[model samples]
Every structure is written in structure tokens, then in C-alpha cells.
Target chain A: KTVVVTTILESPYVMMKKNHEMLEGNERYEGYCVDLAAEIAKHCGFKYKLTIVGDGKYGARDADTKIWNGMVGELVYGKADIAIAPLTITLVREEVIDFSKPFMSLGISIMIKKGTPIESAEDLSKQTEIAYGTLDSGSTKEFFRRSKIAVFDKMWTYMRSAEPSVFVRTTAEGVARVRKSKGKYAYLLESTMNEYIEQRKPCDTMKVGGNLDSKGYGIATPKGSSLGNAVNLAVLKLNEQGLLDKLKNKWWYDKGEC
Target chain B: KTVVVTTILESPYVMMKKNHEMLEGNERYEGYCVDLAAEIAKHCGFKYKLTIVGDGKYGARDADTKIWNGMVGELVYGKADIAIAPLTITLVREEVIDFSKPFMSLGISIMIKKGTPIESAEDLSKQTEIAYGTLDSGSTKEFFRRSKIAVFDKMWTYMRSAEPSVFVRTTAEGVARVRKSKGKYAYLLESTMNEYIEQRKPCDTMKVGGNLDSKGYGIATPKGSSLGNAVNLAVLKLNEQGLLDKLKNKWWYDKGEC
Candidate 1:
């Protein structure tokens, strides 16, 4: 049986190949997650097909309706057997799904224009001169919304009530806002994506400040899925062999322009 | 009912209180893991008792007898309900026990006498002028023994065959060799312990180069234990709240002299 893998199409993690017009099936995409999915399937001894998440979300529960959306929903509804993307492993999501030991470690980080004056989250929290926000329906946004830390709580309050709405629907939208806003806007996102963007062409953005917090991205499975243990162990074995680190370097640095 | 917690007495993670003679039970011990255990129990609504592992080993399986030992053995043999030490979550251990999501991240790193010439694992591997080894019956040693990477495989071959047996009984012994061997020896240990040593008095050591590989320390329990889920969620919550970072600074830096 071919396992269905639900993932998001994020730069350098997943993206359409340039020659997709001629390619078929899995060969139509290429990136870190694409490579990871192949490696995991090989080690775990399973066949899998990659599918972009229908709603393009990492996963979050609706406040009023209490329905899970995004890749998480796909797993909950049995639309996919696993999620192999940059999906964050959060406590809420874990209640409905199982996550392999982290295949990659990252944290919430700040993204700013190259010359932005901000040096840390505290700097943004204390001033209104520079506007900031996170991607909607993602862990970055949820982090601030649930944070009890004073600076994050204050920042979240401001973002929730700010005019014109500060939240973005996609990571690219957030990056573009930072680039176009000059120094007037900042974006909060995962350090993995931030670092990847820093090395790409145009290189007009920088990841400033220490990570706001630490965590990892895991391969998620629906709760009690029989395949969870094997996939989790595969991740740990890959990590021990240095395959995970090598993969990140291959995608994030080997192809870097700056 | 009180949960039985098994741990080890590695400095900064767990240690005797300065005024231990005047304290009893949990009050007799102090450090990051002690504080962490208290925090975990609080969040998970459980009363717990901490016991030091009987053998003082970190847990490894004997190839001939196939018997497990150390904190991991405690969980496996049902002598302890939970093991809260700096137990490295590995593929072999996870096969018999359950581990919560990692509460802390670290990697195998090099500890050098401050003036040592080595800058990275690659540098150490290619030369026989300097001696390097890891703690016996621990993940550091296992990592080298099992690594498939060419550099690490070469390192394991040399260490396993070196004269006078470079493997040490404990981390302190390894550090002692590095400190007293002048510059002839380097200690391969977790980066957390390496960084902690870098800040302590005597301050004659440094962590050089990037980490060799990345992984995390997880709380462990017997497979199918009821407490596993709650403890795992607690770790994630503590991380999100910045308590984990704060706890690290408290133990690793707050009392540092160098």
C-alpha cells in the first residue's frame, strides 16, 4: 500500500520543480522535505506519495468551532498517513496526532530588513515605530497568542488590535511585507526559513536577535497510527548518521546565492 | 501515590545541596533537573520521589549478556517509574521504553584544554598526535561506535584500538583526563556538559568547533506507562513558556565564575 504524505509547499522545504511540466508523480517536486520523505520511506520500508496540504496550513484548532485545519486536519480525517514538512510539534497538535522525535531543531525568530534597528524581541515590544506580525494559522502566531511572557504578550495584543491587520496568510507574504516595508515592518518566523531566506538572491532581509524560544519540527502521524514508532525511530537513526544535518546543508547552503 | 523518579548526580543537572546535611529527601538535592522535576510534577499534578540510579551508569546494553544498565535499565526493569536524568534518547532505548518529547537539545561536542590545536572533529580525526575518547557505557561512545560517517567511523576505529583504553567510567574522569593530560587529550561529551564545564571554575577548558551531531535529552518511562503523555506535554509547555531556557541559564551561567 502507498502511504499518503501530507505536506506544505514552503520554499526550500517543498516547491514545484522547474521541469515539472515534463515530470510525473513525486519527481514534479524537489526540496528538503521532498528529499526527507524519500529517505524516510526507504528506511521505514514503505511506499509513499506526497500531496500538498489542501488548506496550506501547519495546523491549528478553530477557537469558536474547535475544528482542526491544515495538515493536521488531513491526518485527523485520514486524508494522509503522515506529514513530512516543516510542521511544528506543538502540545495542542500532539493531542490529536503523534510526532516523531524532532528531525530538525528550530525556534521562533525575528526577520527584519537588512538595516533594521531591532536587536531583539524586547526592542520591538517597547516601541511602536516598527510594526511586526506573524503568519496566521501557524505556530508563530499561536506562540504569541498563548505566551505569558510580558514582551510577547504585549506584542500579541498590539498585533491583534492593530489597524490594517498585521498577520499574514503565508510565509512569503510576511517576507515580502518586511522587504517592502523597508525598516518599518518586521516578521516573526521559524529560524530555518529565516536562515534560508537570508542566503537566497535579493538577500535584503536578516534574522536578528537570539531565537525567542526553542523547539523542533517532527514528522506527525494521526493519533495511535501503527506507523508512528517506525517513522520516529527512522528519524532518530537518520539524525545519528548525520543525514538530517547533511540534508539541511545540502538545501540551505549548497544552493545558496549569498 | 508518589511517582518514583530515577536520576544521576551529574553536576548542574543534579547535585547535593550545599547545606545537604540540614535537608531531607528532595530537599537534599538541587540543580536543573531537580528544579525541572518539581516543575513537571506541579504541571502534571503528581507527587514524586527522586532516587539516584544504583549503578551510576547512563544505561547501555552489554553485548554478551544483553542486560540493560543505568537509568535506562531502571525504567526497563520497572525499578523506577520515571528516569529524569540527562539520558540521551536513542533508537535502541526507545525500543523498550517510552520517551517524552525532548526537554533539552544537545550534541556530541569536543572539549579541549583551552590551548589545544583542534578546531573540529575532522581536525581531531585526521591526526594521531592528540588522544580523544568518550565516556564508556554512554551515548557519546555509542555514537562513535555506530556512526557510518567516514570521519566518525575512523575516529571510532582509533579510539577502540588505542592503548591504555581511552574510555572513561564517567564524564568527570574524562574531563579530568583533558585537564591533567595537558593538551594530549580531548573529551568527547555532550555539548551541555561541555558548556557547563566551560563556565565553572578552573575554567581551563573550552568547547571548540560546531557540534558533531544533534539530539536531545528526554524524560523516560516504561513502554505503555500512563505518565508518559502528561510529562511530554509538560516539557513542551515549559519550553514554550521560556522556563526551560531560564532553567538552563540558572544552572549553567548564574553561578559561573569565568
Candidate 2:
């Protein structure tokens, strides 16, 4: 069966090539996940369509309303067959859709300007001089909100209250805030994306502090999809054949703009 | 309130001091977990009595018998207030008992002799020129046994049937076999322990390649225990304060025998 792969426009994972206006269909995109999608399709013997998530989000569920957003919503609502992006595998998301074994392992980490005095979440929570936040309605924010731990609780309080509001809608916006806020703001995002951005142009941003949590990006499929097992095996095969590492280097390091 | 701490005697995590013949109680032990237990107790406002687990194993369930072993059993059987050893926070364990947010992160890694021909699991799985093993009761062995991933399943098949039997009862035994067998054997264990041993006497063993899997060790408590929240906060506090990194360096590198 032909599959519809849902994704997001996250840099280095799924990005429109500079010459996208001259291209059509899948030819307009080129990034880590783009290469990964091709490899998975080739190995699993499936034809697929690559479509960006309509809501332009990773995915988050509303606690009060109980509605899912982003690619997860697309899958549960039958708008897509699979999701191929830096979408994380989390307990909440796992309830609605299935994620194959992780293709890339990462964790939430602190992103800051090169000379920022901040180190960890504690550093940012202890003072108002510097503001910190994460992509709203994302795992990082959910981590703080659901946490009962002291450090995280305190961080959540600070982030929820800061005058200008510390939250952002996308990781790129958060990173831009870190860059433009002149060391007054810090962003929290997945370590792989943070590290990838650090290698990009202007090189003024750096990831500091050990990651706050452990998780990974999985190729997402709707619950009980027929292709889930094949996609999983395809990911494992690529991982074992060293294609995952090679693709990461190709998109993250070798193409370094800095 | 008094806490009953169930621990294991793994060197550098919870082992008796060199001169413990003259010591007693908590003072008799010295290592990473010993320090962590103390820190947790102090912050959580409880006095604790440390006790070694009856079985030297980490923790695992016997498939045929459906019985638990090691620290996990102590918590599940209501024999201990908490488990403060290097017990992994896995989904299976989480189903039966509560785990504090990880106090320390680690992963399954390969330990090879300094001049071994192996670099990764792929190298070992592809040839009969070398034998590799893991502690039979640990997470690494479970990973090999249950992984549907081709590379790991192939390795598991080789390990489960090798004539001499590569599996051992403890990580120390696996390491010894690797050293004694020259370049013919490699031991698979947690990256934390493998890196620790690499800095110990003889220094013939080295942690090769990246870890095969990523996970963390958490403080375990019986389900619905009052201390679970406190213990979880204590771990996050330690990690945020940089005490975790300090303790790691103190135990692993400061005491380097080589």
C-alpha cells in the first residue's frame, strides 16, 4: 500500500531547499529525515508521499479539552499514514499513535548564548535577570508541567510567570530569542537539534548543561498500522548498517554552515 | 521516619571502604551510591539503614518461575523502603515499582581488551573469531535477548548457544574472561561500570564504540510509597547542583589505579 508520511518543517530534519520554487513534490525537500524516508521506503518496499503536518507542530494534547494537535492529530484522524520527523516518543503521545523503535536518541538540553552565565535550569530559575523557556505545547514544556520534582517545579513557576513570557511556538523562534535577546534568554530544545544549530552559521549559540531528560525520535505510525513492523525493521537495519550515523553527519556536520 | 535502603556491593557504587574492618553502619561503606544515599536522606529528612541485597544480581524476573531477584525483589516484596543501587529504570520494572527520576544515566557498552580486533557489536556479531558475553541477570542480557533488531538478535543467538557458554553471573566475571581470553572475548556491561573498570588496575580493558543502548539508573521504591516523590526530587536536586558529575569523577577518575 502507498503510505502518506506526515512531517514538519524543522531545520536539518525537514527543510525546503533554497531552490524549492523550481522543484515539485518531494524534490523540494532535502534534510536528514528526507534522506531517511527514502532509505526506509527502499528497504520496506513501499511507495510513500511526504506531506508536512497541517498544524505545523510536533504534537501536544490539551489537558482540559483532551484534543491532540500536530502530526499526532493527523495520524489519529487518518490524515496521514506515518510521521517522519524529529517527533519524540513520549508516554502521552504513545497513547494515541505508535512510534517505531527510536531512530535517534536525544534529551532536552539548555541552549544559551556563548557567554551566558546560565548553566542548568536551576541557574535560570534562581534569577530574573535571564529568562528561559521552551517550545510551547511540546514535550519540554510538558516535562516541566507534569513534573513533581523540585527543580522542575520551580523552573515551571518561573517560566509560567516571566513578564514578557518565555514560551515560543517553534524551536527556531526559541533559538532566535536566545540569539537576539543578548544573553537575556535561554531556550530548551532537544539535544540533537540544539547541537545541530550550534554547528550552523554565526556559531554564537552553544548547548550547555547536561540534558534534563532521556528520550528519542521515533518514526510514528497510527495505532496498529500494518506497516509499523516493517518500518521498525527498516530503522533497525539502517542503524545497524551505519546509515543513521552517516545521514546525521551528512545533514548535521558535513553541511555545517559555520 | 527511617528508610530501609537495599543496595548491592558493586565496587565504586556501594562497596565497603578499604579499612571497613574498623567501621560500622553507613560509615562502613564508601562509593557513589553511598554518597548519593546520604545526600538523599539528608535532603528528604529521613534516617536510613543500609542493607546489602541477598542476591548479588542487579534485578530481573525469571521467565519460567515469574519470580523477581535482587534489589527489585526487595522493593516489590516489601522487604525494603527503597533500592539505592544501580537498578535500571525500565518499563518492566516501572510496571511493578516506582522509580525516582534517574539519579545517573548510562547505557549498554562493549568492554574489550586494549588490543582487541572488535570495535562494535557489529564486529562481534559478524565473526566467530571472538566470543562476547554479559552478566546473565542484567539489563544488557535482557536487551540482547528481547531485541527484534537483527544485529542484537544475531548476537543473542551466538551468545545463548556457544559451546563454553559466554554468559556469566556478574560483570566482574565477564571482564575477567575478556582479559584472560586475550582478544577473543569482550564483555558487555553498563557504560558507567565499563568506564570505571577501564580506569582500574591493569587497565587492559577499554570501552569501545558508543553504547548499544541508552538508559539510566533510578532510585527504586515500592509502588505508592510516600518517599517516592522525595527521592525523585533528591535526584533532580543532585543532578542540578552538579553533585552527580562530581561524584562520578570522584569515584571513576579520582581513584584510577592505572
Candidate 3:
């Protein structure tokens, strides 16, 4: 039996090749998660297949239906054997799934054009000229929605009711808006992705301020699956061997333009 | 029943007040972990008694008899109800105990005099003039002992049998050695403590290069203990409320003298 891996099309984690239509199997994609998946598979000695999530989300549950969505849904519904993406480890997720020890660390952070006047989240909340928002249907968005902090609660109130919806459909779209808005927009994305974009050409964007919160991304499997044991151990072994750090440097900075 | 909390007396995390000898019970101490324990107790509504570990070590298993030691040992032997300190969450420890989600993240980092000429672990591995060491019987030493990476392995080889015995009995002794050694001694320690020291007066040292590895400090308890579930949720709740971040800035940087 082949292990079915569910992932998302997130740049620098997993992405399509420029001429991918002619390619077959794994050669059609390449990036940090793609490379890490190969390392994990090799260590665990498994044949695998990679498939993107049908909904293209990291994972979340709907309040009305109480049904899980995104890569998490695939695992819960038994449509995939494991998830290998920038899937965050969270309390709600842990109830129905198992996560390896974190393969990488990240946190909610602000991204802005170089020389933007804003220096902290408080600055953004206290001003109106520059607009700010997070990617919809993800941890960062939920952080703001659930926050009890006065400043974040105020920011969320503005964002949820703002005209034209400050939220974006995808990370790339959020980044594009920042580049074209002439310093009028600030995007809040995970620090990992923000740092990756900061090194790419044009190099017009910069990660501003310390991260707003800290968490990690884990390799995930359905609760109590046999694969969870070996896969979790494999992640720890690779981390100890320094392979995770090497893959990060390879994808995020080895070809850096700035 | 009064909950028993076992902790260590490391700087900034847990420390004695100046008039400690005249005070009794909880009033004798104040620090990050001390504050954190209070929050956890208030949320869980438990009356608690704070006691330092009989042995000052963090926790390790003796290969011969396989008995655990340190704050971990207290829990395993039924001497303590919970551990709220800078106790690390590792595979070996996890087998015998349960950890709340990490309240803080850290990694093995290099601490050096401001102009020590070391930028990475590789730099230290290739040199002989700057002698370095880790706190005895702690996770930092265990990291090097268990590492398979070439640079770390080489450094471990030199450190294990270095002339004059480079290891220190406590974190304070290590910091003191660095300050008095005239830039000749480097202390390999967790980044959290390193950052705390860097902000203290006589800031003759700074943490250089990126962290060597990433991990987190978690509140711990005996495996399957009844308190584990409520305590874990309390930690997640406090984190969401931004109390953890506030406590960190309050303890680590609010008193900065540099």
C-alpha cells in the first residue's frame, strides 16, 4: 500500500514547477516541504503519493456545520494517510489528529514595504491611512478573532467590517497587494513566509516588529494511526541530524536575490 | 489538598528575594516561573505549595539503574504533583511524564564576550583559544552528547575531556566564569537565559549567531496525572490571553540595564 500525503500549494513549502504540465509524479513539484517529505519517506522507508488538498486550506472547522475543512478534513475523513505541509499544531486540532514534534517554528508577524511608517501592531491599530489584515481561514485570522487583548480586539473590529474586505484569498495575493499599494497596506502573515519573501527580488517588502505570537508546524496524521509513531520519530531524527535546518536554508536563502 | 510544585532556582525564572530569610512560604521567591505558577493555580483554582527539588539537576536517567533524577524524578517518584520551571520537553522525559504545550521556545545558543570572534558553532569547533562549556547534566550537554552533526560532534569530543574541566555546577557559575575569564570562556546555554544575561548590567557579553537547535520549555507532570488536563488547558488559555508574552517582557527586558 502507498502512503497518501496531503499538502497545500504554499510557496517555499510546496509549489508548482514552471513547465509542470509535461512532468509526471513527484518531479512536478519542488520546495521545502517537498524536500522534507522525501527525507521523512526515505527514513521511514515508505513509497508515497503527494496530493494537494481539495479546498486549498491549511485546516479549520466551520461553526455552523461543525465539520472540519482543508487538509485536516482529508485526514479526518480517511481520504489521506498523512499531511505534510505548513500545518500548525493547535489545541483544537490535537483532539482528532496527532502531530509530530514541530519540524519548524514560526509566529504571526507583520509585513510591510521598506520604510513604512508603522513599527508595531499598536501603530497600525492607532492609524487609519494604512490598512492591515490577515489571510482568511487560518491561524493568524483566528488569533485576532479570538484575542482578548484590547489592541488586537480593536484591530479585529476594524478588519471584519472594513469595506472591500482587507482579508485576501491567498498568501501570494496578500503579498502582491503589499507590493502595489504604495505603502498603504500592511499584511500580517507567518514570519517564516514573510522572511522568505523578504529575500526575493524586488526585495521591496520587510518583516516589521517581533512576531506577535509563537507556534510550530508539525507533520500530521489521523489520530492513533500506525504511521504516526515512525513518522514522528523520523522528524526528530532528521532535526537532530540538522537536515531540517539544511532544507530551510536551501529553499529560503540558497538562491536569495537580496 | 495542596498541590505541590517542584522548581529550580535559576535566575529570572525562579529566584530568592533579598529578604528571603525573613519570609515564609511563597513570599520568599519571585521570578517568571513563580508568576506563571500563580497564574496556573488561580486559573485551575488549586492551593499550591512551592518546593525546590532535592537535587538541583533538571532530570536525567542513570543508564545503570535507570532511575530518573531532578524535577522529573520528583514527579516520577510521587514526590511532587507538578513541575513548573524551565524544564525542557524531550523524548526520554515524555515517556515518563506529560508536558503542557510549551509556554516558551528556546534553543542551544552560543554566549560570548561582545568581541569574541565566534559567529557560529562551526567557529567554536575550529578554534582552541576560547574554551566553552555547558551546565552540568542539562539538556544543552545532552544535545551535544546525542548529536550526529559533524561540527557539534567535534565540539563535544573536545568538551568531554578538555583539560581543567570546562563544565560548571550551575548556570550562575558559568556566567561568572565568562565574566571573569577575560573573553577566554564561552558558555553554551539556552537562548532564553543568554538573552536575559545580555540585558543585565555589565553587559560584557552577547549571544552570537543563530541558535544551534530549537525546542521549548514546558510545564510537566507525572504521566496520566489528573491535574495534567486542566493544567494544559490553563497554559493554552494564558498564552491566548497574552499573559505569557507580557510576563516574558516583564522579566527579561523590562529591567534592562544595558
Candidate 4:
């Protein structure tokens, strides 16, 4: 219980620095979750190391093999003691691992160019004009594929067969596509990153409209891990003390360009 | 003063029920807003006549003559003490009249057939694959037409000259087009009506994504009317006590088909 935490290198979360060349191990990174991990370990009276997930998935269960991937897999298969990043607490993931109270809440949100006409999910699903896609190999695409709701199901069907394969392997790739697609493409993503990027340079992309549905990101431990309750308490304490909102302002608004 | 409340004959909000020859006064109609009016009146100590707007418009300022027309015009011209229909509160309209705090909240929503590919307003505007429009002369239409936001301004330009003039004369016509267009039409409407229609028979339509904007429907009075304050207080009181939600359930859910 004194060590390993699995995370991913995503912006404003867990990220390697430009000077990461000289920094070693955990010193190579700093972000929302970096601060979060330090806070949790300090409160719990432990020392830990961060290990970035090799495959870079938020986690999904492969139907054929019934095996997991990414941070959830790292915990499920006993490779890490906890996951301290923006891994979504999906229904399927919960079956195999334990999640502390949510540290951050987010949902599928729209990422559009400065002047794109997209307003709601329905608007995109009903046309072929401005293309939209989700990050591949993650909970985002799985959300669409598993949707029972009419609009999302239609979106899934279209994206599932979209001619050029709109899915991107990473969030960075997806954001790049949205930036470069002119006004021709929109990327559906987690709201935290959506807000973060909307405030970054170029400043031409905006998080338009509301999220598709509500979901949250939580710290994950293996099923029945003793670490769960203490982590949950820490998150609640942070929230009640307004530490969470302060951190959000520090990261998102403090860096805002738009 | 004796009051005349201008309302429109929108189904399930204000409607003439099946019986034609056996009803009188407000008893001739039965719908969500009809019941809402009685509740508001009883709470506020008022007796009023509900007069359906003769022209059936939600009200808009005429572009050519600068004269207001429809329910809003009725109030502007002193023909009614207040409007009790699902009349939206818009900045343009707010400049000319007083509105109670919103009795009901809604926004511009997308309506689509069972399997449309469109998902957001950007999707609809990016290509002509699916057609979408708002009720002519309503706040939703005016919102697009008068918007300064880049996305909405683009949508307004397209909507203004698109072949067949995507604007519909009425909500029912929009819903009908959504159904009959065979997955090629998406109707932009108020979320309240979109939700109401989603549960009725032949329920082939679904609201997609989130709404384009957030605004609400308010009871309106001409500038400086005394009734505005009283109606506003009544609406807040009803909202606090959950009566608005109960009335919605009574009308929309008591006999839902889908």
C-alpha cells in the first residue's frame, strides 16, 4: 500500500514537462492529478511512485477475451495499488475494481471550431456536413457504442461506419484533428479537457452546448482494496474545504487565454 | 383590473379538449398551461379570462414596420393584461415588455426521426444532409436571426436562404416534417414541446444531444404593468413547492405512450 499508482500522461492531468529530460520518475510530471496524488498519499501517510499506463487507455473490457486495458487493467490485474487520474468510473469497470468517491465529474462534450454551427448532439447526428468523432480505445467511444438512447445510438451507428474512421488513438491526436479540420470536424471529449483546451492558445475552439450525459472520474483500486474508503474520505474533505474548486481555477482559469 | 390572459392553443399546454359543445369559459380547454393558469390565479388571488391569441404567433417585432405582433404584441398594445402561454423570454422582447420570472424553463432543442445522423447544430449547418428549422416568428427563430455569436450568425445566414426556407409555420408542422421526412429532417424547437411530443403516440421522434441555448418561458405584461410582479412571485412560489413539476407530471406523464 506504500507505492505504485497508475496514471496516464494527459494534459492538465498527468503530463511530462519540457524539462522532463532532467527530471526523473514522478519529478518528470506535474498536473491536476499530480497534485491530487501527492495530497492523497500525504493524507494517507504513505510514499508512492507514478507509473504511466503503457497502452494509454482509460480502460475497457474486451468482449472476446474478457480482459481489461489501461489504468483499470493495471489495477484489476494487480499491477498497481491505485489509479490517480481521469479514468472514468464506467459500469463495466466498476464490476472488476473499486472506485473512491469521484474526484472529478465530467461527461461527453462537444469540441468545435470557433464558428462551427454544432449546438447539440442531435444536430451532428442528423447531418453529414461537419464530421464528429470520439477518442478511440476509451470509455468515450464505448459510450456511444453502448448507448440505448435514440440520438446517441444513431451517432454510434454513423461513427461506427464513418468512411474514414474518425476515431483517434489519443486525446492529443483528437484535439489536433479538431484544430486542423478547419471547421469541418468536431471532437467529442471529456468536459475537463474540453474546458482546458478551450482556454488554451489558438483560442479558436469552444466547448459548445451541454454534455451528453453525466459521468465522473474517480481514483480506482482493485476490487475490495482497503485503500478505497480512506481515499473517498480524502476526496470528500477536499471538496468540502473547497480545495477542488480552487484547484480547478488554478489549472483551467489561471491558464486561460480566452 | 379585470384581466385577459393571452395564451396560444398549443397542444398539452393550452388546448381545446375532445368535447366541443359542453364547455364554457376556461373549462373548454385542458392542458398543462391551462391547469397552470388556474393554479397561478388561485395562488395570486385573481380571476381572469384566457383568450387564445387570434393570430397564433408567439410574438415577434416586425422587421419592416417595427410593430410587435402575436401574443407579445397583444400585451404590447394593451389587448391583454398578461400572457400565460409558453412565450419565451428574449432580450429583444424584454426591452419592450415586462416578464415574470420564468414559469417554465426550456431551450432550443433538436427533434429528429428514429435514426438520423445529425447530432449538433454544427452538424446540421456543415452540410445539407438533413434539414432543420425553428417555428417562424418564435424566439427560437429570432434567436438565430438576431444572434451575434459566430455559430448562430452562420446558422441564421444559412437558414435565411436555404432552399424551401427551413422555417416552419408551427410546432406541429415541424414535428410532422420530422416524422415524414424519413430521417432527412431535424426540427429545432423548444425542449418542452419536444419532450411532450416524445412521449405521445407514433413516438418516432427523439430529442438529440443538449439544447442550443438556455432560456425559459415567462408570463409577460406590457411595460410597467402591475400584474408582472404578482405573477412572478406566484411562479417562484409554485416552483419552490414543486407544483410546476407536479403539473407537468399530471399532464405529460399520466398517460404517456413512449
Best by lDDT: 1
Question: Quality of candidate 2's docking, in CAPRI categories?
Answer: incorrect
Clashes of each: 0, 0, 0, 20
What's the residue-level lDDT of B42 in candidate 3? 99
TM-score of 2: 0.63
Q: Point out the higher-scoring one by lDDT: 1 or 2.
A: 1
lDDT of 4 by residue, B98-177 (tens): 77656666668889998899888878878777777789888788778766656667888888888887888888888998
Q: Over 4 Å off in model 1, which ranges?
A: none
Candidate 4 ranges with C-alpha deviation above 4 Å: A1-258
The DockQ scores of all candidates, in the order shown, are: 0.82, 0.07, 0.44, 0.02
Question: What DockQ does candidate 3 have relative to the true complex?
Answer: 0.44
Q: How would you order the candidates by DockQ, starting with the best? A: 1, 3, 2, 4
lDDT over C-alpha atoms for residue A251 of model 2: 87
- Give the TM-score of each candidate: 0.98, 0.63, 0.93, 0.52
Q: Worst lDDT window (10 residues) for model 3 chain B? A: B232-241
Docking class of 4: incorrect
Better of 1 and 2 by DockQ: 1
Q: TM-scores of the first chain across all predictions?
A: 0.98, 0.97, 0.98, 0.97
What C-alpha lDDT, on a 0 to 100 scale, does residue B167 get in candidate 3?
A: 94
Could you arrange the candidates by lDDT from highest to lowest? 1, 3, 2, 4
Highest DockQ: which candidate? 1
Off by over 4 Å in 3: A43-47
Q: After superposition, how far is residue A192 of candidate 4 from its true place, in Å?
A: 14
- Residue A256's lDDT in candidate 2: 90
